[PDB]
Curated annotation (Swiss-Prot):
The gene is GFP. Changing V75N: In R10-3; matures to the red-emitting state with excitation and emission maxima at 555 and 585 nm, respectively. Photocytes. Changing Q76H: In P4; leads to no detectable fluorescence. In mut2.2; shifts fluorescence lifetime from 3.03 to 1.94 ns. In mut3.3; shifts fluorescence lifetime from 3.03 to 1.88 ns. Changing S79A: Increases fluorescence at warmer temperatures such as 37 degrees Celsius. In GFPmut 3; highly fluorescent mutant when excited at 488 nm. Belongs to the GFP family. Transmembrane segments: none annotated. GO terms for biological process: bioluminescence; generation of precursor metabolites and energy. The keyword Nucleotide-binding does not apply. InterPro entries: GFP, GFP-related, Green_fluorescent_prot. This is Green fluorescent protein. Green fluorescent protein has been engineered to produce a vast number of variously colored mutants, fusion proteins, and biosensors. Further generation of mutants led to more stable proteins (at 37 degrees Celsius for example) with brighter fluorescence and longer fluorescence lifetimes.
Length: 242
């Protein structure tokens, strides 16, 4: 462990839904400092390799916030869990019913995003639908000001069980590089709970190694973001807990 103890597992099946390439659909509805907007994203995910590719488009015009600050909001069920960690994959165990993912992302010396999302299967598509609300932002800050570089760093997201809610918790800091050479910080507080009633896997302490790369699509007139990612679970000693 390290911040939470696991309450045993005993519930596999959703696991089987991720053996092949699975189509992803992302839908976000947001309001930041009164600035309403919407975003749609589509792509593929292959948990077998912890790989996912997604393209996002702000369908309401110009994105009110920097594309990078929305990366974490825009499907950890696609992480690659090694064989010796299969009994610790909460995200896949909750499928197809899925799970609710809630976060509070606080930007140092600035506003904060508040997000609630439902990730589940609809047909053969893994869907992440989100409602985002941000407040107390500085209309001149780095967010509403678009002073962040169009890039992303690698991060480690630590996961701990939350037996009290039959789900998991996660806390981590995202480091966004500012054009001005500095770095904007974003504190993430995450909470995931299953949507269904079936049994789910509560994990022992471990983390997700996340690697991301952002790009643009020249043949795209709309404000967008192309995302490539590799996610693999780690930090767990074979045949054990903690």
């Amino acid at each position: 462990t390290g911040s939470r103890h696991h309450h045993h597992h005993h519930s596999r099946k959703g696991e089987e839904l991720f053996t092949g390439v699975v189509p992803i659909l992302v839908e976000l509805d947001g309001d930041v400092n009164g600035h309403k907007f919407s975003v749609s994203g589509e792509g593929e995910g292959d948990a077998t390799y912890g790989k996912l590719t997604l393209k996002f488009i702000c369908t309401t015009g110009k994105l009110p916030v920097p594309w990078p600050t929305l990366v974490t909001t825009f499907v950890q069920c696609f992480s690659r869990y090694p064989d010796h960690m299969k009994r610790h994959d909460f995200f896949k165990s909750a499928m197809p019913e899925g799970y609710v993912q809630e976060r509070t992302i606080s930007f140092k010396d600035d506003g904060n995003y508040k997000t609630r999302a439902e990730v589940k299967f609809e047909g053969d598509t893994l869907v992440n639908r989100i409602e985002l609300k941000g407040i107390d932002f500085k209309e001149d800050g780095n967010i509403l000001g678009h002073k962040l570089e169009y890039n992303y760093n690698s991060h480690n997201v630590y996961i701990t069980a939350d037996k009290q809610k039959n789900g998991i918790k996660a806390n981590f800091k995202i480091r966004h590089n500012i054009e001005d050479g500095s770095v904007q910080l974003a504190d993430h507080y995450q909470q995931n709970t299953p949507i269904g009633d079936g049994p789910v896997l509560l994990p022992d302490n471990h983390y997700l190694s996340t690697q991301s790369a952002l790009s643009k699509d020249p043949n795209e007139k709309r404000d967008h973001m192309v995302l490539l990612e590799f996610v693999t679970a780690a930090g767990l000693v074979p045949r054990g807990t903690g």
